[PDB]
Design a protein around this ligand. Structure first.
Ligand SMILES: Nc1ncnc2c1ncn2[C@@H]1O[C@H](COP(=O)(O)OP(=O)(O)O)[C@@H](O)[C@H]1O
Length: 1133
């Protein structure tokens, strides 16, 4: 003990949160220095300095000491040090930590307010604050347990960690050091501690002294604890040596209790000597978890006391080394050494539940779940632990009542995201929703769909989101009522009416993982399903009900794939730990492991024939391996791939092994000899590198399908010919697929939660499977191909039945639709996502299908009775509804048909395509009027007053044709490039403005020049509308911007346009009242004329909307997102 401090060192250390010396301190200069050395041996270059050793040997104390020396601080870590206490943590654990470390480093919000909402984000937000804002700083990781935790700090920093396992760094790259600390000190130093505690000097130290140290195994933690006794009870020296002698401590699980012995004893004793009043307070600390510094306030409510008092009480404990604590800034928080938490938990075992119940009880006697303001020292403790205690006390009614509440969700998510809660629901499911209710799933699904929204600023009206759930959901009822209980307050909640129809409701949905699901598959008889994800476990459940069957902890790192053997007798799993494992599918007992791959093994499939029993594995190490489960050894190692082997399947006729890799090849090895028979280079891309993934065989084993970037390809196993090439979801990359055994069906997880099954041979999409709003990693058919499963990042696994999914339906449409608001109801005609078009009557299912050669655009004749449509090949057809059959085909159009509309009257059909003519087919007669704009291409058009028609091409030109007399009355050149949209002033028509990459020039039809150029937008206008007379013209920006302008030749009124939109702003529309402006782009969003927006609500699952259909009453809306979901909203009662 002494002084190396410098007031500088002080501040730097107090800032980084570095705990300060113990009650009694004894230098260990020999080691302190050794560490420091390893620290300079870092230089300026990032690295790792590890201090390892048995618990309580002093590792923490040592660390804090190393950075307590100006000489080392300045000129080395000039930027300071940051102490992060971590301990044993799971994914949610580490987030709670990182979140905290982030509230610390960005105290000013130098780079965004709000904490990170997940580990991945957090890691990033940190790699910045550390490589600027805090450059040349030392990070202190205290008590690291798993290697993956360091993998989040592995961002070019200089880190000094403490750990019991000297192997937590085996999973990290970078220069690494080590500094072993002996389990215990030396009799001299040991004696020193006691010497300093009792107040003597080794000389006057009783005989037992040299003998006591021997019992405390030289462990500082233990020694201090005892030295604390001998101090508070100066006579009983030989007495205590005796107690320490015979460890009278009896803990269940007798067995091999290491560090316990000595510690348990010292603890048992010291605690027993606590005054008969503060004795029950310490017992209460048996619910204080390992690695969790508790703020004072917590205990005040626990013990119905007040700040000062509590602190004194707890100060007594700290004085005996029964409790530790450090400054969090004025307010104090107290922790416990991991070893003591174990002591207390073992001792007071049978009271734990009650102690947990005592907490919560005192939390309710003082707070409300959704009331705690973010200024309370204990604010955090409650959010991330209130749920814990309730369940640790096994309180159904209490817990349920907290989780099954939007207020809690809203309150918490807004503070820490939905990450944690999504975990809680899985964890506490058992004690949570049981009975017969599904109120759990409801909230469980609720968090899936909107998880992406919750926590993100601006915090989304939780009531709205809840209104978009099934009527039959608690989430809905809670939100609905939350609404009505406010009826009239300048809000108005839109209410998705056809919410019912949409939602491809899958026959079954399973939630058994706490992290992303990477792969899942059916048992050979299809009765069961096994799924393995990033949560490190192997899971199995009945295919029929999701009824959990097995919950194994398969690996020590993410599980990339899993499969069943030919007789479902086994299940293998291969993971990132580079191991492969075999399990008894019945009992789940490990039936041996095979570690031989260098890198992570991705592929693992068994032989199909019930005869032989082999396992094939592909790995990032470029090899493939055949294992003979009937042998403790590998059987073959196929060398050959140029890159990572991503997939492999045995042929039905077990003689061949197909293999798929990143080296751009498909390959057929010969099982019986592990020899490469063929290799098929994938060269269908325009030298570029391509990765092939999923790759299954045909029924006869004579064909193989594979996926590469945007395509699925069918090869002839023999000739090696490409028998087919279907192009998938435009331009993205197929993440996974699976070929059925019938109907040449193929299911592929397109790109990001999009799932569509195609028909090879027909080379056409058959169905759109909408079920996830988070990445889909895997997907596959049951063995009879009667159904398929979906595995995703939203950590769910859903089972679908093919038949039901492939049936044609109005659940998913294209964005080409037309609506007719006819008072008593709404009517939507839409181009089906696969074949024809649907006559959807909102406010009633009444969906009527009309098949057709895949139309390209729709059209409704006011009065219904007739519907018209565009064609890919240019065809035009009117169908008459009253009959629903007899139609007509008016010849014309080269390119595919774009816009298409009926005349005011039911006769004549104006239509445009991708060329410069506008067909005016006055059907019924057979007459035609052509408008050779001679432009380049008619961008679009729209009917006008009396048989007059406004038209704009992307040549800056806008014309005013006359139907009946294809005569260009007016012709303007209002822009030097594509005219994107433009509307009329409706009222009168004195005005009709444009918008076109640049600004929004507004005019009057007459003056062959614009009234005034509005060069406001920086992104480029894409839409606009005139106030229903009013005197305003709102314009849509290509960058979510949207300025309001005034009908007065040219000005620049208020630019209400945040983003802190969600991509583009493809539409606007003033309200009759000329006060509320409705907007649509990445989502709908209402505003308030003249500064400030409004009901910024309604987030649609999908984005990139186009044209929002408001109605007369401005109390009904219809739209369609790129997810093909039909939104028919309508202001609440
Ligand atoms: N050098 C020391 N001098 C005095 N007490 C010490 C010393 N080292 C450790 N201790 C005691 O042990 C405790 C710190 O233990 P710690 O270092 O955190 O164990 P671990 O290294 O396994 O995390 C303190 O409460 C203190 O009383």
């Amino acid at each position: 003990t002494d002084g190396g401090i410098t007031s500088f060192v002080r501040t730097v250390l107090c800032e980084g949160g570095v705990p300060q010396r113990p009650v009694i301190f004894v230098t260990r200069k020999k080691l302190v220095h050794a560490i420091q050395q390893k620290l300079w041996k870092l230089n300026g270059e990032p690295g790792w300095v590890t201090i390892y050793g048995m618990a309580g040997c002093g590792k923490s104390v040592l660390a804090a000491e190393a950075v307590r020396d100006h000489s080392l601080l300045e000129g080395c870590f000039s930027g300071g040090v940051h102490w992060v206490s971590i301990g044993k943590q799971d994914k949610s654990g580490l987030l709670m930590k990182l979140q905290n470390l982030c509230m610390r480093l960005d105290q000013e919000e130098s780079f965004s307010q709000r904490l990170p909402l997940n580990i991945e984000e957090a890691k990033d937000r940190l790699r910045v604050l550390m490589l600027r804002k805090h450059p040349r700083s030392l990070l202190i990781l205290d008590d690291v347990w798993d290697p993956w935790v360091l993998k989040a700090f592995d961002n070019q920093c200089q880190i000094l960690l403490t750990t019991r396992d000297k192997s937590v760094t085996d999973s990290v790259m970078g220069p690494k050091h080590v500094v072993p600390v002996e389990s215990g000190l030396g009799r001299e130093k040991g004696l020193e501690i006691l010497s300093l505690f009792v107040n003597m000097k080794k000389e006057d130290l009783p005989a037992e002294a040299h003998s006591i140290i021997k019992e405390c195994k030289g462990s500082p933690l233990v020694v201090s604890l005892i030295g604390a006794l001998l101090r508070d009870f100066p006579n009983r020296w030989a007495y205590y040596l005796r107690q320490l002698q015979n460890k009278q401590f009896k803990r269940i699980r007798k067995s091999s209790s290491y560090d316990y012995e000595a510690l348990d004893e010292a603890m048992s004793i010291s605690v027993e000597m606590l005054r008969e009043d503060i004795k029950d307070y310490y017992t209460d600390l048996s619910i204080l978890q390992k690695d969790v510094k508790v703020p004072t306030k917590v205990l005040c409510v626990l013990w119905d006391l007040e700040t000062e008092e509590v602190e004194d009480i707890l100060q007594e404990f700290v004085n005996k080394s029964l409790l530790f604590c450090n400054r969090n800034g004025k307010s104090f928080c107290y922790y416990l050494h991991d070893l003591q938490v174990d002591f207390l938990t073992e001792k007071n075992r049978s009271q734990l539940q009650d102690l947990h119940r005592k907490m919560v009880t005192q939390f309710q006697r003082y707070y409300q779940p959704h009331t705690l303001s973010p200024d309370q020292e204990d604010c955090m403790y409650w959010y991330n632990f209130l749920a814990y205690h309730m369940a640790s006390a096994n309180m159904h009614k209490e817990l349920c009542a907290l989780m099954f509440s939007l207020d809690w969700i809203k309150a918490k998510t807004e503070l820490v995201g939905p990450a944690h809660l999504i975990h809680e629901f899985v964890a506490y499911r058992h004690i949570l929703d049981e009975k017969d209710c599904a109120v759990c799933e409801n909230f469980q699904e609720f968090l899936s769909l909107n998880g992406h929204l919750l926590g993100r600023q601006p915090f989304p009206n939780i009531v709205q989101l809840g209104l978009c759930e099934p009527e039959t959901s608690e989430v809905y009822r809670q939100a609905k009522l939350q609404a009505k209980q406010e009826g009239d307050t300048g809000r108005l909640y839109l209410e998705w009416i056809n919410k019912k129809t949409i939602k491809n409701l899958s026959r079954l949905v399973v939630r058994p993982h706490t992290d992303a699901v990477y792969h899942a598959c059916f048992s050979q008889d299809g009765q069961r399903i096994a799924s393995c994800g990033a949560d490190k476990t192997l899971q199995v459940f009945k295919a029929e009900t999701g009824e959990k069957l097995l919950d194994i902890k398969a690996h020590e790192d993410e599980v990339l794939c899993c499969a069943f053997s030919s007789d479902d007798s086994y299940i293998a799993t291969c993971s990132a730990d580079k191991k492969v494992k075999i399990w008894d599918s019945a009992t789940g007992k490990l039936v041996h492991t095979y570690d031989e791959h260098s890198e992570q093994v991705n592929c693992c499939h068994f032989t199909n024939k019930s005869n032989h029993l082999l396992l094939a594995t592909g790995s990032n190490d470029f090899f493939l391996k055949l294992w003979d489960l009937n042998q403790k050894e590998c059987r073959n190692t196929m060398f050959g791939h140029t890159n990572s082997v991503n997939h492999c399947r045995f042929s039905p006729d077990d003689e061949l092994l197909a293999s798929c890799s990143a080296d751009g090849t498909l390959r057929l090895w010969d099982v019986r000899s592990a020899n490469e028979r063929k290799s098929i280079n994938v060269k269908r891309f325009f030298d570029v590198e391509v990765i092939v993934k999923c790759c299954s065989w045909s029924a006869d084993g004579d064909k193989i399908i594979v996926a590469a970037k945007n395509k699925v390809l069918l090869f002839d196993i023999h000739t090696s010919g490409l028998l087919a090439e279907i192009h998938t979801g435009h331009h993205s990359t197929i993440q996974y697929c699976d070929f059925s055994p019938y109907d040449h069906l193929a299911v592929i997880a397109l790109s990001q939660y999009c799932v569509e099954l195609w028909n090879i041979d027909s080379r056409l999409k058959v169905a759109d499977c909408r079920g996830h709003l988070s990445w889909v990693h895997g997907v596959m058919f049951s063995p009879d191909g009667s159904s398929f499963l979906t595995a995703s990042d939203d950590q769910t696994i859903r089972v679908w039945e093919t038949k039901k999914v492939c049936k044609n339906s109005a659940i998913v449409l294209k964005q080409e639709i037309d609506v007719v608001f006819q008072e008593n109801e709404t009517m939507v005609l839409a181009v089906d996502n696969i074949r024809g078009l649907q006559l959807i009557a909102g406010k009633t299912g009444q969906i009527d299908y009309l098949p057709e050669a895949q139309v390209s655009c729709c059209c409704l004749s006011p009065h219904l009775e007739y519907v018209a449509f565009g064609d890919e090949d240019g065809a035009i057809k009117i169908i008459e509804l009253p009959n629903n059959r007899v139609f007509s085909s008016g010849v014309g159009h080269k390119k595919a048909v774009r816009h298409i509309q009926f005349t005011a009257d039911g006769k004549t059909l104006i239509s445009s395509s991708e060329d410069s003519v506008i067909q005016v087919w006055n059907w019924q007669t057979g007459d035609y009027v052509f408008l050779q704009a001679h432009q380049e291409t008619v961008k679009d058009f729209r009917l006008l007053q009396d048989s007059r028609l406004l038209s704009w091409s992307f040549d800056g030109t806008v014309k005013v044709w006359n139907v009946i007399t294809g005569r260009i009355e007016r012709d303007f050149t209002c822009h030097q490039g594509t005219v994107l949209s433009c509307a009329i002033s409706s009222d009168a028509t004195k005005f009709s403005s444009t918008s076109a990459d640049k600004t929004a020039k507004i005019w009057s039809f007459d003056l062959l020049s614009p009234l005034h150029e509005l060069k406001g937008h920086n992104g480029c206008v894409r839409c606009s509308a005139f106030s229903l007379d009013g005197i305003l013209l709102a314009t849509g920006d290509d960058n979510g911007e949207i300025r309001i302008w005034n009908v007065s030749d040219g000005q620049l009124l208020h630019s209400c346009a945040p983003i802190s939109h969600g991509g583009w702003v493809t539409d606007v529309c003033f309200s009759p009242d000329s006060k509320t402006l409705v907007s649509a782009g990445g989502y709908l969003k209402w505003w308030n004329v003249a500064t400030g927006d409004s009901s910024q609500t309604f987030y649609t699952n999908g984005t990139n909307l186009k044209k929002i259909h408001v109605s007369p009453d401005f109390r009904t809306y219809v739209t369609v997102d790129n997810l093909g979901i039909l939104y028919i909203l309508q202001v609440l009662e």
